């Protein structure tokens, strides 16, 4: 417990699920993270770790 | 000038380019925006 985050972002990135193009995965996988994000788990989530 | 903002922000959303279903735009709006973000526009944008 000797750091210390300080200041704002200095730029914008995010982390995402990766799948080989043209997997049949794709589509249900990006729609699984936008209703995990939409019922607020992802945030929960966050939290917890 | 006699508000301001106060503390990080409490969550995270984003806004993006949007294109109806079955667009040939899709694929290349979206490695556009990408570009620019990496590049540094899109920061600079802002600020300006």
Do not use: R
């Amino acid at each position: 417990c000797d750091t210390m985050k300080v200041g704002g972002n200095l730029d914008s990135k995010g982390y995402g699920i990766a799948t080989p193009k043209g997997s049949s995965l794709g589509t249900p996988v990006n729609l699984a993270v936008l209703k995990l994000s939409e019922q607020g788990v992802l945030d929960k989530l966050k939290n917890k770790w | 000038c006699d508000t301001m903002k106060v503390g990080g922000n409490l969550d995270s959303k984003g806004y993006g380019v949007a294109t109806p279903k079955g667009s040939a735009l899709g694929t290349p709006v979206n490695l556009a925006v990408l570009k620019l973000s990496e590049q540094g526009i899109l920061d600079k944008l802002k600020n300006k």
